[PDB]
Symmetry: C3
Subunit: 336 residues, 3 copies
């Protein structure tokens, strides 16, 4: 163990993959490399470390989703605490497995640096999300180098949920956040220009309104939105009123840039692991789907896991939950 | 030990306390919530970890001080190395004990993030004081959330002693330091507006002169001063000359803002643990007391401990030292 | 093990040294304190931790170099990973040994904080070089205090090789880098004004061109250059064309400031540990020596070690390599 003999890193072997189209940004759409408009449709699964701990990190999970749930995309929420606990080298080795599985099934990955808080002050909602600017840069530097020229890995979601929690974490400042995303994007593009960065707004990735006046000044990006049921709070709960509020905060973005709702979903207020902002009577499902389909918005439901809520499944035999059965039918129909 | 099951933090239970007035800032004074002018008068004790290590962290210490030494305030100098060694969760559990003890005795706490150095460059006088901007923010975020609405915890002293040690630690810059304090204050006020932040100047919390032109731009704060005997160095040592020098550097602040001299004290030049700037023949005692009483300045003597110098006590039976006997009489008389 | 009893640091004992001239900057030259023009001529050796691990950290190494290789200078490349692995206290104790050895032999040390990457974003070429702004400041704070007034330690080389690796590590920005060096210099000069800071440019300490318009705004400094054989790439390889390219990027600096080429050297393209940018047929040796001698440039060859390449020696009996035999003759002749 001489530190001077520690190897320089290696890149994923693209020859190990079957042919797969690259996804790219064109105006306000994604397109495949055949030129056809593309929509990300799929789910989040849990952090790789959580799945490994219960022996659920396996190809059979991806096969279930691709073959039975109609997904074309899986979002991997890589939690900083798990990145550190497994260690970068081991974690990347498991992401490699996901790449191979996904490629074999013809589906795509969104790699999400899964933190919640305010990166400019390095203050977070919970220790599982704890990180630094330095560690965040390093994650993207390592990821972009390793998966250079890998079509399967389509989207780099830079920071899951920006929030200052009522300014208890710092003073939210769009200019500062914009500049930091631009810095990350520049590192990424210096290493791989074929990948799609995904940028989020404040109020837990809900409010993209700042981009009306001050969008990120880089091409080829998309914007994230997390339009959970309780984020908009109209006094009268109907399509028209939710649509208008969604329009104002995030939906407008889809007129100019591609948008991925990288989290959405619900559970009954008296259901399993129910909490604000995910409580709903179920009318939200058809509403958000109708709204997204109208605008051509892409999405990954939270979450295809039986422990973390709101769940899509009740157990590891994949018994569907209320929202699981709903979205499964939606995705299957969209696939046709 | 699954990291996703680590609990979110809880707040101190205010129902566990007896009725106690809140202290607040009004102009250049502190007032209690009955509207009466209030003066912090008390002592520092040692870091909680030091006391626990010798089994001296107990209610009987607070009882000695309240009943026999006339104090209405105790300053807790929380050293970053001890915060890390005990760990936040355990350290906060011991601060809870202090809150309950102090509340029962009708006295107040000043919570002091006890570092010495230059936080903007993260360089310090000694490793026991080592911290980062990130860790400092986190400390105040955790403290402010936990003690929301707790009258007993009156003052949040953001950073004990700013100094660049002759610019060996960085280039002292008031604008940069001011901005950082303002950032901390904003985090604190976003979580609890009833607490009093206490801000310090350069030259080891001695020089408040920068606030003449550029005071912190936030309401409800106070300023710290550490007017140890050797900080002012008049050629002729008398009341008039020390008073003028104190006026110029820190005393003037009390005309506009409340001031707490959160450290002061002396030992004979040939006494126990004697060092610059605490050496004095004893004439300093009546002088600083006269000066503070004239201006209505609050204070906490350093230190009610038999090991750390200058001591107020010779042993844990509370045998008074020279300065201990002096200040004990002063505080007892002021209490009457 | 009470953290409050951890000692404050001590300074190297200058009384332990024999008389040795201080080296200082005067215009574009170094001069000794007798007023005579001085040129650093010597070698790098490996990191102290690497040498200790094979029992090669000993005075006999310095004696070999001074007595048999004509050196007046040794550059110590202190790798951050090794600084952390040995720990500051132990590492400084070994640097003390080097100081005593070097002083006894009448030779000088360049202390090099041996990182490769972009310090403003804290991203690096390899983990052995990993550091932070905080740790880098702390290193120089500790070094400058300890070796105050020690003539033997002549040059503080602040950061070995700045590079953004094609902007994959961050966006190279001269203004930001300049400001950071100025910050380090100010810390150093606040502690010891007799030492020479050595500042490097981008493209792995190759490109000093930014200083034409925006030199570091501090007196008494020198500039580093690492003119390895493949850094300049003329289509026709001859003296004239290399000289012009070297002139443009780094050589011009020697007209106004002292310059130390703190790394240079070569190995045959099919030789031991051959890599870009050190591959050459050997014509580089006479060329760079001629160029440096013309301009009065100082230098330390990389590297007097049998493992790290390009080597000056084949084994620890000091069998010379191709470049070793070449530079040994050059230095011996220059000494005469
Ligand atoms: Cl927010
Ligand atoms: Cl809730
Ligand atoms: Cl200062
Ligand atoms: Cl002293
Ligand atoms: Cl560069
Ligand atoms: Cl190569
Ligand atoms: Mg890709
Ligand atoms: Mg309070
Ligand atoms: Mg020196």
């Amino acid at each position: 163990n001489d530190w001077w003999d520690i190897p320089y890193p290696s890149q994923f072997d693209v020859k190990s993959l079957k042919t797969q189209s690259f996804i790219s940004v064109k105006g306000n759409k994604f397109i495949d490399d055949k030129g056809k408009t593309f929509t990300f449709r799929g789910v989040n699964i849990a952090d790789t470390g959580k799945l490994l701990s219960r022996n659920q990190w396996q190809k059979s999970l991806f096969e279930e989703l691709a073959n039975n749930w109609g997904v074309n995309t899986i979002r991997l929420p890589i939690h900083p605490v798990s990145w550190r606990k497994l260690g970068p080298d081991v974690y990347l080795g498991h992401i490699d497995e996901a790449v191979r599985w996904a490629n074999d099934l013809g589906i795509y990955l969104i790699l999400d640096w899964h933190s919640i808080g305010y990166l400019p002050t390095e203050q977070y909602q919970h220790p599982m999300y704890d990180t630094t600017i330095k560690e965040t840069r390093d994650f993207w530097r390592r990821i972009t180098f390793r998966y250079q020229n890998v079509p399967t890995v389509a989207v780099y979601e830079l920071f899951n949920e920006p929030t200052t929690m009522g300014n208890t974490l710092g003073e939210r400042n769009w200019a500062e956040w914009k500049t930091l995303n631009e810095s990350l994007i520049d590192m990424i593009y210096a290493s791989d220009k074929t990948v799609i960065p995904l940028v989020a707004g404040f109020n837990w990735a809900y409010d993209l309104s700042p981009i009306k006046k001050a969008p990120i000044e880089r091409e080829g990006i998309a914007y994230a939105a997390h339009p959970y049921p309780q984020k908009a709070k109209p006094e009268v709960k109907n399509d028209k009123n939710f649509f208008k509020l969604w329009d104002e905060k995030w939906g407008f973005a889809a007129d100019t840039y591609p948008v991925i709702a990288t989290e959405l979903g619900w559970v009954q207020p008296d259901g399993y692991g129910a909490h604000i902002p995910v409580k709903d009577d179920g009318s939200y499902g058809p509403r958000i789907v109708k709204y997204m389909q109208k605008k051509g918005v892409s999405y990954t439901v939270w979450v295809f896991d039986p422990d973390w809520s709101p769940t899509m499944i009740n157990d590891w035999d994949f018994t569907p939950s209320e929202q699981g059965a709903f979205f499964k039918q939606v995705m299957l129909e969209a696939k046709k």
